[PDB]
Amino acid sequence: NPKDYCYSARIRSTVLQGLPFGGVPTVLALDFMCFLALLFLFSILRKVAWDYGRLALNGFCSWLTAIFRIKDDEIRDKCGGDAVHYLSFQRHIIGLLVVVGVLSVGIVLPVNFSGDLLENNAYSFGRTTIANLKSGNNLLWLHTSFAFLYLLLTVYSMRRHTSKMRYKEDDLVKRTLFINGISKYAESEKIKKHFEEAYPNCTVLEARPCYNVARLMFLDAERKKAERGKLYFTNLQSKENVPAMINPKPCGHLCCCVVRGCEQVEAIEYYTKLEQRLKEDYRREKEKVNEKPLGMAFVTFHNETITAIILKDFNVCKCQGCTCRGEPRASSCSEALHISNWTVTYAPDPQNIYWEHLSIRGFIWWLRCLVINVVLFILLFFLTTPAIIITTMDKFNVTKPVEYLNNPIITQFFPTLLLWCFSALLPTIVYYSAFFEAHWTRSGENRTTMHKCYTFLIFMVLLLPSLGLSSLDLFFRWLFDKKFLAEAAIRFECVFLPDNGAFFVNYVIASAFIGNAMDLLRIPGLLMYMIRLCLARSAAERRNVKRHQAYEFQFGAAYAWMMCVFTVVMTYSITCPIIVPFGLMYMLLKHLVDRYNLYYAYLPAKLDKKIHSGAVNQVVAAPILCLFWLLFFSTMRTGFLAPTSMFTFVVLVITIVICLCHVCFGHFKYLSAHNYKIAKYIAQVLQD
Template sequence: MVLLLNFIVFLVLVIIFSIIRKTFWDYGRLALVADNEGFNESTHRRYGRMSSVLSNADDHEYEGRFCSWLPYILRMDEEKIKSRCGMDAIHYLSFQRHLLFLLFVITVTSLGVILPVNMTGDLLRNHTQYFGQTTLGNLEVGNDLLWLHTVFAVLYLILTVLLLRRHTSRMKDRRRETTRNSLFVCSLPKTATEEDIKTHFTEAYPTCQVCDVTLAYDVAKLMHLDKERLRAGKNLRYYERILEKTEKPALINPRLCGHLCCCSNVEKVDAIEYYSTKEKELLVEVRKQAEEVPQHPLGLAFITLQNEAMAKYILKDFNALECDSTSCCSCCGREPQPSTNSKALRVNKWQVSFAPHPRNVYWENLSVSGFSWYVRYLLLNLLLVVVLTFLTTPTIIINTIDRFNVTKPIAYLNSPIISQFFPTLLLWSFSALLPTMVYYSTLGESHWSRSSEQLSMMRKLYFFLLFMVLILPSLGLTSLDVFFRWLFDKTFLTDGKMRFECVFLPNQGAFFVNYVIAAALVGSGMELLRLPGLLLYIIRMMLARSAAERKYVRQNQAYEFEYGAMYGWTLCVFTVVMAYSIICPVIVPFGLLYMLLKHLVDRHNLYFAYLPTRLTHQVHLGAVNQALAAPIICLIWLYFFSVLRAGQEQQQSRNGVKHGERSSK
């Protein structure tokens, strides 16, 4: 019944998306219809597609019929995705395909071997729910077939390592799009000049030719002002074209939401005069800020050399001196290659690495560094932990609702749809809100590059989702608050009782199966609709002052694909499936269904809905490392289950002996 209900919801969501896509075509291909000029002007977090011109043949292929986009994304080859979305999309989709193959193999073995073995037991044969007979709990502690579960858990770990190793080897074999001939130098004296730095490299490394030296400055305010100036200029050109066509000046309401009926009585102004004045004022501010920028150096520099070999030679010299001490010479006994400017430039304090791609850098965040960055990072993450610990755990919300007897009338219904569908849907809803909270907290950390931002987002999201979705429900704990009290509070166990014998009950496995079903069907449908993005788009359209600004919003409503959030979300469900693949093998086919639908949805969104993101390999390698945790957690869960079962068996034997002694007395 729960599967049928989730499937109906999935069909409804897909039909709604197809109708919206057919009726409001731009919503279905945001990243393809965006004006190139609009994206080039936006220097904050977006940039144009690598090939944004669509042929009429391609347009006709996926525009013609209802749901014609579905066969189109199935037929898309790797080269087409690479040309639109970049190499990062290829790495991401390849990772999903390897997980798909892994889950397919595990599905065959789980349904063909583990499930029949579990059903040979008779501990839960008289249980009211048939589902319990499919779990490991149906086998007795001394069953001769229990060794199969451990063997298959180890085989799953080995297979996961082999497949992910194949994925990483293919990722490294792919040719890089750009050569690394630039170095990024940190901890420079703020009084250093480009000529001093170039002289140092020329003298210290005479075999290396320095082509360019670029110092970094605090340009956050300048970038914001320039973006607003370009936006005002574009709005001005829009109304100038209208004036040429209609020969009538356009009037606008300069207030926020001025086009709404509630603000229609406000006096209107001439659009060309308004945006012309605004552009001139912003141009003056931009020129003033540009004059002040050289007064705020950041102690950072980009060094461009003739080729990659020279960059590697210099980088090797600095990396050879890395040690535990903050000063290289204090532990290694020597400094890097010297020059006449070494002492003035404090070369022994430098931190040198390959320079990230310009599109991978958040130039406006380079001014946030040192102690202030670490304080910001700690405060934001402490706040995130507090919020997630005490407020967003689903069980806490349910308990709070129960205090007001809101759920009593629902409980009286005694319906399996109510008792099974809505708890898992609630857990999925809160776990779906979690990426948004982690996303904005990560933005507030002001990372210097997209790669470090996405890596931080992926790690935090995976950690919190794992606790919310897998660890706490499996241990029967209501929240991180109870978990920490159980770990560190000495009086907690004496005042209360943790019923660990209730962990891994048959119904608990059914809960996780229902969660994976909801994530596969409801989650995939919601990702197609992208409701948060649609709501944000509606709000931005309402706040626009004029038709020109509304056009600007339409041209800039596509955002970069958040690989960190998508990796974290996918790995969470994958870990849940792997953790219960032995204990509850019925979960694996639905995990395969989730990964298949997720792969198709991501192919569509990468191609049609999101702009490409340029990242380093560290993000994709980080996802591989986190995926390796899934089969390890499976082994831990199996060990934990075995220890609990053995402890319960011993306790029951002791109770039986005591009862027999009392009877004899």
């Protein structure tokens, strides 16, 4: 009976996934052999293939021995506070999946193995899962009880973490306010004079307005390319005593024969005239920029306390005839400066700001972000999961190129190869959208990346293929429907099949071994780096590429993938106990790989605490989803009104409600996952 739908949302098993114990004994061995293969490969590719694994700084395995020798203090001196707090998050989850580890394997698994309901059946893996319990047993009360305890340990884990965190930001930031919405013709003097009149112990050290710096930074970078060329070809020619030539058009290497070619243009003359031209237009822009004030300012005060009391004075809220609202105070200049409109906030760190993107404000930023997210959301609505893509392909017969050869290896392999393809592609199409919204700050870009990327992964990886729905259209269709309340059991009975548990254990094994080896190899990065290197039109530009290619570490993506595997592991934790040790093994190997990547591979970022403290929210999201997975199980077997179905519902109603109060204000303390202890603001090139 449960066949024509429960295996609809993933393409189906190869060689039954291996005969014994749901394939786990087979898949674990093969993925482990791929681990040994890909790390042997990385040991060569790291050291040989144009330094790509080594840029942001040895015997054959001194890479590996370095992972085990690195100190936390030495991460701090190399990578700054964001790396330390990121590694502190992981270390709490490695502990949480050891208490959950020992309680799931120690007590939930032997209680399952006791049961009758799947005893005779062939599927030996299935016995370890909740489906093996008889319905009329208080043993379901123990499963309800642990699903509750795992919420409290997850809350206690993050209350511990957050109290240790004690994030540090430089004193220049603590005294600087970002004032947004000021009059466009507010010269520095009047911004200074407003506060230095209006507040008692006031003194303003700086008041720096913003300007439309976009093209001025473009020209600075181009000018730098010109200089790097001129200097290198000079230094080369002084030693070689022979000149060099480059084609002025793009992709100059491809000019292999003279047909409108003109490859013979001399390097020194080229870089000279180029540098002079760029210097000339750079001046023209710099003089023009002062006629484009963006109508914002950063103001830096002498005193941290007065910064606070201004910031409060503009955020106060009290009664007037229309509404409760704020009332910022009068002065000599309050009208000319339009103090009616000011939004006041602590400024980001000046390396956290995108001085380009400050240009894009008001109606147009929202119109542009809306367009990107509406077009994206429609695409994710109808193509949410790889299975609906492959199924729609088959319904339009586009498998046709395979049957040119029609080899029996290829026709059976090709579907799995395309699932790998779309599974890697669809979260990437989400992740890259954040790079076109033009967030004003690297915090904003990374927060947006976490919440979008994670949310999509929870539907692509966990929810949709669990209930056996291929797409968000199909999910809302089933939810709105006509008779949901009278038939939802047919989809809940689909979540707790042995086959479905076995699939999720296998997802985590592939994620532990192959997944992490790919995070070490970074082959898309390597491929883009080699193609960019090869297309560079000159020797000077090749060296330029090698220095530039090391990025800042993508904390938002790194969290989004991490809490996703945690969410799979801790939803399937009570219902399918065997999954948790592979969840732990994923976290050890991820933690070793990230210590390498942060220190050796990536450059340091600098991001506001909003990201690190934001990722704490999704750690609470994991055990919340696990109580749903028992409200489903309990409600379809015992009924809704039976005790285990009410208990794990009233708990959940309290948990949803207290979260949505937190969404109005993070002012709760005792019932809260967060426990806490109490010249540079000029655009990078406008100065030059």
